[PDB]
Every structure is written in C-alpha cells, then in structure tokens.
Design a binder for these strands. Sequence first.
RNA 1: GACACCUGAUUC
DNA 2: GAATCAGGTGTC
Lengths: 136, 135
Amino acid sequence: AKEEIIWESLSVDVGSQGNPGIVEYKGVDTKTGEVLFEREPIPIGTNNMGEFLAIVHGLRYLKERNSRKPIYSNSQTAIKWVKDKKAKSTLVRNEETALIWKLVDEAEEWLNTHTYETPILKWQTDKWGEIKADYG
Amino acid sequence: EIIWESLSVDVGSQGNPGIVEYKGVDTKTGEVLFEREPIPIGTNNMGEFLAIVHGLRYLKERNSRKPIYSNSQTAIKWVKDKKAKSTLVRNEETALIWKLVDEAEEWLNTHTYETPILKWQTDKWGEIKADYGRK
RNA sequence: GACACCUGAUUC
DNA sequence: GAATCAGGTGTC
Ligand SMILES: [Mg+2]
Ligand SMILES: [Mg+2]
Ligand SMILES: [Mg+2]
Ligand SMILES: [Mg+2]
C-alpha cells in the first residue's frame, strides 16, 4: 500500500524523564511542526497516561476550533484508552501521583461528556519514521 | 558530593565495537595509576567492566578503602552481579577481550572486597576524571 | 511477541 | 546527525 501521511493534521507525543517519572506532552501541526498546545512537566506520571492526556487535549483543542483535522498518535495504548473512554493505568494512586490522576480523571470526564468528529489515527512508525511531535 | 580521595576509571575506544583501552586515575590528582594496552576488538561495556575490576584489584592489594567511580551503569551492574553480559561474538578475532573479561569475572568470584563502587554523576559534576581525550 | 516511553554509556 | 553497547518500565 502507498498509505501516506495526512499532513493537514495534529500530531501528539509525550516526553519523559524516567517512566514512571517527569512527564510532558504536546500537540503540533504535523506539516509545519508548530506547537499548538503543551502541558507543563508533571512530577510523576507514566508514558501511557501522558499519551492519553495528549490525545484528549487534542480532541478538546480541535473541537473548540471546529476543526475536522485528524489526530496522530503512535501509542496503541492511549488510542485504545481514548476509544474505551477509560485509562487502564496501573500507576499507584497517592499524594505523589495525585496530580496525574487528577488530570486523567478530568480527561475521562471530558470524553464521557462531549462528542467529537476527530479521527484518531495510529502513526505508522514503520512506514513513515518517527512521529513529528517528538521532543528530540 | 564528590569524594576526591578515590579512583576513577573510564574506557576509551575507536569504533564500538572497536579498539578499546581503559585506565584508572587518582580522582584528585589526575595521575594515571594503570592503563590497558589497546585491545583490537572489544565493546565499550566490556572495557568499562574490565576497568572497574582492574581498579578493584588495584585497591585490594593495597588494602585501600577508597571508593571507585565509574560513569557506566551497565558495568557497575555487571560487577555487582559478578557476571558480564556482552553480546560480542566470541571467536579467534575477539579471543583477547573475552579472555580478559572471563578472567575479570573469575577474579570477582575468587576474591572479597570492601570497595564502594560509585556512579559518577556526569550530569552534575562534568565528565569523569579518567575520561579519554576527544578524537 | 507487539505498541510505546526511558536510563547510562561508547564512538564516527 | 548516524551507529552501537547495555538495563528498565508502562501497557496491549
Ligand atoms: Mg508517542
Ligand atoms: Mg516520541
Ligand atoms: Mg565511561
Ligand atoms: Mg569518557
């Protein structure tokens, strides 16, 4: 197949220091690389929770702007979680991990109370190389 | 913080896998205490492993209690486990490095030591003192 | 096995 | 920027 990148899109990726560890995420214009949104470093979180938050944040960003652009993520886990509207994270829940869980609860609440037209697509890393929203 | 009364070791190579050498130095002085003759074919991690054990033997025979610094997370673990886990092909071309690694492992399995093996915090203190010059 | 995210090094 | 040597966790 000649499946090609849809450039008119939003790509999200997570960046961390450790896992679990410090987690950040951002959404960029797939074509230009321009950062559209970002999250301040969360002291303790996992890669999957971060990828999940990033996609939902993207859904909210595009909906508010009445955009029909699809969202790309290379995380099969986060994509499934958003589809299920449930983040199945094993991260222990306590004072240290209270913030990331608070954000995850907020994202689930959002997914369960809003509809969206956005196609959530799996970034074909093997076919296209690293996703554009990567940190470096 | 940094413990200056210590021995620092590091590997150096040209290619990886490639030619490898290693050395130990007085962390404070910078004085070279030992330096291995270049080995034709080896890996960076095999070299870091040899360097630490060599340092261990060096301190052991002097009944020194000073610690050893290495910036190698891999080699520090191999030493704690008393087992190197290199993926390097084992044959006539790599016989020397493997002979040294086998002997270093055997040394660990035939001696006791008190020497604390510490991780050099490159992120905070800069490059290890036994570092090899660029190029 | 798969999709990810890292950690510490060695070099060219 | 490219390549290789090693150890580790989150999830499906
Ligand atoms: Mg990702
Ligand atoms: Mg990435
Ligand atoms: Mg080193
Ligand atoms: Mg060095």
